[PDB]
Symmetry: C5
């Protein structure tokens, strides 16, 4: 994620012009290789037309250029591309919203799972750790960065999200499906035990705990589903062919023709098709942004900060349910009591 929210708090004369200077997370870094390839192909074709082709070959080439310029608009680039990008962006925000955050659970846990003693601390920390473990399991399933951090379950154990006995039980479960849901079931069982022992003092609190657990587990399931049900491959293929087919056609149709031939709208050889380069910038960059966003859990500059979220959630959950449990300042009259 490349945040710039603070820099655009106010409308100002410069606008986003200062943002145009950023490299990390920028369109330029995404697209300069493709832009250079388009420009190089165009210049090679132009040089061939200017220096290699005989006069008769030049006349036929001019006919081909006029034809391609005339009929490249038959390719409905904006239609398919607008649809595709809208779908990708909608999925992008929904996937961020499905991130397995444990803040609501930590609030319920600190409010409902009681005891200053070692056993109460163990209950609170372990419930929070099961939630964090489910998050880690699903994220190493769907995020390339998290998987690199945790290539094996042994790495999960070494980071402290899972104990060795927990690891043994996890591997002993006979199931060929992804086991990210296992710590949520452990959470439900541990909550039942806490209720049975009276650490959870009432049925309503136990119910709230199970409700928030199911909300969390559903976020993990949504991440699983977004990972499994990709944007339909047909759409990705079609949009890709649309952009590439159009610019392949433009490599010919946008050639600068010999002004002495007197073709309509061809009396100026600027030698750099700067409007065509701008059009490639916009359409191919739109597609390139969709490419970055389609899997927001990779290692693009602006992909989601999944490892950061894992670390933050573990740290904040442990703080909230262990250090801050039943640790309040004195009930005092506020400044505006009178």
């Amino acid at each position: 994620t490349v945040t710039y929210t603070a820099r655009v708090a106010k409308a100002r004369f410069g606008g986003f012009s200062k943002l145009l200077l950023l490299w990390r997370g920028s369109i330029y870094k995404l697209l300069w290789r493709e832009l250079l390839c388009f420009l190089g192909l165009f210049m090679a074709l132009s040089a061939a037309y200017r220096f290699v082709l005989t006069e008769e070959q030049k006349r036929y080439f001019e006919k081909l250029v006029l034809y391609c310029d005339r009929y490249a608009s038959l390719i409905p680039v904006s239609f398919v591309l607008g649809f595709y990008v809208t779908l990708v962006v909608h999925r992008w925000w929904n996937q961020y919203l499905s991130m397995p955050l444990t803040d609501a659970l930590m609030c319920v846990v600190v409010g409902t799972v009681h005891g200053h003693d070692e056993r109460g601390r163990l209950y609170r920390r372990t419930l929070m750790r099961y939630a964090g473990l489910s998050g880690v399991l699903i994220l190493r399933s769907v995020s390339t960065a998290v998987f690199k951090r945790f290539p094996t379950i042994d790495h999960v154990v070494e980071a402290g999200f899972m104990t060795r006995e927990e690891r043994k039980k996890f591997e002993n479960l006979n199931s060929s499906y992804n086991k990210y849901w296992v710590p949520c079931v452990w959470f439900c069982n541990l909550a039942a035990q806490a209720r049975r022992e009276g650490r959870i003092r009432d049925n309503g609190a136990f119910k709230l705990l199970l409700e928030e657990l199911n909300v969390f587990r559903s976020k993990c399931g949504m991440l699983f589903h977004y990972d499994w049900i990709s944007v339909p491959l047909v759409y990705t293929q079609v949009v890709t062919i649309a952009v590439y087919s159009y610019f392949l056609a433009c490599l010919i149709g946008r050639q600068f023709l010999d002004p002495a031939q007197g073709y309509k709208d061809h009396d100026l050889d600027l030698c750099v098709p700067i409007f065509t380069l701008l059009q490639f910038f916009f359409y191919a960059g739109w597609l390139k942004v969709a490419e970055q966003l389609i899997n927001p859990f990779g290692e693009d500059d602006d992909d989601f900060e999944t490892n950061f979220l894992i670390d933050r959630c573990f740290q904040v959950s442990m703080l909230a349910v262990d250090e801050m449990y039943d640790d309040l300042a004195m009930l005092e009259k506020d400044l505006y009591w009178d």
Copy 2:
């Protein structure tokens, strides 16, 4: 479902070009027959114009070609097609979201329905099995693949989702409507019995069980409704006529005319209307993708994996509520306890 999420985790120079090489779930496999039919019809008309028609017939045909090319744009293909595809895709994701998954129920069941003995195991497994049975019934109602797997209720019994006595009661119910809802009522009754016998220890847990049951049953009902209330037939007919009428017109309007006749924008006979073939690819392929997505529970390559989901849900539910019930590792201090 043809997943490729992992392959597009990062924006890369190639883009989706590597995805262009996929066959299963690809646009090519969906559309090559129609594309070949368009090309063959076009070439037959071109050959007739080139070899069969007399000169006067050729002049009249050229007039017709110019006319059709001029006025085919009157057909608003992008308008109707954009609307139709947007509707279909929205329905597609909502239908996936309505898949009858039992994970939330299994969490509540393992947390609230107690007893290590045979009776407690029976309660937990049977509640989960009733949920899975409702899923199977609705899916064999709406999914062609699931119906092929379970052509009769006898097949449901043989797979273990329903007992023979349960089958007898199911058939004895006098109702002409789809009975997918029956196991959800069985679930409610069994939960009431569990509460009465004390297996469900509190009213809040019983309430949570009924809430999650109703959420699940509503997902099944949504699948029923999406199956019953198709995309309006008027829309499907109109969009189909739009695409076919436009390309039927293009079969004439996009013919290559004799360059010696000197018609404007007709001084080049490439003999293959490659831009028209690309346009058919895009518009007819858009329609073909809508055709794949409109019923996502069929046997297209990228239709939903309904049998896989049935098997996964049964396996995971049974594991969670039977093997993992009240089976926790020792409460131990974590790595960062200190």
Copy 3:
């Protein structure tokens, strides 16, 4: 409702071509009268130009035709029509979702309202019947078909949804507003009585019953609101004028002009403006589909099956809460118990 979901489970070579053969619920049945009127008006004007008009009148008419063809595009048909159809379709699906279905209530009722005796059966059946009665009242308020089935409250009594004493109380209530909400209040009172007598064993179950009642009542209220707050009349008038004004203009602008006059793009008299007929088909058919969908509770072929839903809900609710109350097969080990 004209369902065809099963026929389009798989993408196939034919596509929706087989659907083009359907009459009931088809675009043809909606639009053939208007299409024939457009064609007849066009042919009358063409015949007048061809046979009645003098040469000078013909020249002036040709000028008028060129002018109308030139400037009919000033009318923004696709703009207003796209907006209008999007609004109508969104409302269409939301109205279907607001249908007063009693399945969730029947689940809660069978799970929480107890007694095999006559009194318990009366409680369960009467709660379900009050819900069904509220549905019937709102549907006869908003659906023309349901109102034809139940023109008076006496017809409601004769169908069994309301008793004679209930009818007397219903008429004795002094209120000029629609009384569809009355049986929901009766439901709340009857539930309170069931709780007081112990038929509802716990406060949580009573709360769940009231929650589901309020969900149901809100669906009925949403139907009332969609019926009362029509699509703004301004929009319907404007879109109607847009389509009609454009095709009125096309009746002149799309006339086939005498080819001997040599007007640009007018050297071919096909005598049937088939592209204009196709354009009327698409735009006027889009408007005609909006006309069908704007009130989905009428008697169009593809309007919602409101009487079917009323009958199904009553039958299924009675079955679920009376015949299937506390009527379970023996708790038995499943096939995969071991």
Copy 4:
């Protein structure tokens, strides 16, 4: 609100043509003054060109007309207008959905607040009246019609929504912010008292009451927020300038030029720019509909019926919680009992 839902239950040959005859709530009534002003300005300019201008002035004017007709399309009317109208309509439906209806509260109140005696009736009626009072306060804050009905709090007292002692307490509260939320806090306090005295028999019912109160209060808050956070002024200004600037340009660019001058596409003087009048009708009428909808709580014909809703809610709430409290017909076997 101008309802016509019943008249369009079925698709019919006439379509919406019969709706074109309506005046109240019609586009004509909204737009005839502006349309007449456009037509008058156009005719004045035409008369000046036809009768006042010298020949040389006429030639320069013809140049200006051609220029304006050529370049008025630079103004992106459909772009900004489509966006603006979409935003306004979305807000319109959301604002209707936020109307402070008390039906859900009345159901909960009649089901949970008990006693046939005077005190129980007082509790039920006063809880409902507090909800209705909050509705009245917010509506007189946001609806011009309601404010005209209740220009002062004294008018609220005289209508019976607030007692004199309640008025004294309401004015004694020291707060410069809108006090619409005050009766909701009174509601919470009165519910707490009812629970303490046993009129609310259980904690679950008290919780449900507070939940529904918070839902209602949130609807009132949403109305407050929609009133405070207008559609951004920048958008309204920009869209207004777009429509006006375009038609100001059309006043010149759409002038009928002297046919003897032989300008291309100017050989016909119809003297009434009927296509331009139609275009003003559509674009300016779209803007005019947005003007009606942007504040749906005013006194436009099709604005929401806020006074009607206030009266209906008070009448229905009082009926439901006072006359119909614990007033049920005998539990009797229904027609299909056997």
Copy 5:
């Protein structure tokens, strides 16, 4: 926020014309500097062409102008800009909806946390103050205006939202992440203590308190996430380049050419490209509105009134839970009791 909802309650002849006179929050104030820069650059280029360039240089410049006018349309300004503005506006309303308002919490607190004595008042005021403190912390994190009001936590203490002992505990917590969530955990702990001491009389009320706390905390978290996950930088850069590149091209392509040269559509030198100025107004103003809205928590005229909301919430919460706790007018018969 610049509200004008009251001024547009009714559709009127003037329309939004009176709104065109507003300066604060207007498009003019946002855009006059950029508009003046465009106009100045255009006039400098025009003066150079008119007075500095030699005849041959003038002919080449005319060729360049024709070329740029021809090909600037290749830049898809409306495509990218429409997408970008739609995304920004959606985020804008969602961010307003995530504002940390404490009204629902104050209702629950006044209804569930009891005692007229000093301790009960302390409980109610402190729970509300913790909620308000979390709001202040997140808002000083995301709003430039709030941060200016509270540059340090010491300023938070001095305003009364946090006590000195609370400040000491807040700083003693060892965490590098934003601590806005800390007072919500304090809230949960204080609620647990209130329940333990009997100030919260029942488990259901305690559950409702925790539910509303989690709703509030989630609003704060949503503000954090919208601040962190900006609109993707790629989109902002691309849209900015689109608008600037197009108008840079227009600086040349829209030059008034010498009418004696006889170029098509160039026989009129108005010397002020008023249609191009209008087009810059619309497109660049659309972008400028997106610039204002992208961070709605800054100090633009129409940014959200965050300091106002902080003050209002504190005042109203304190009033509701302290002055109005259990302070009701006598239960009296209403006007329509009979």
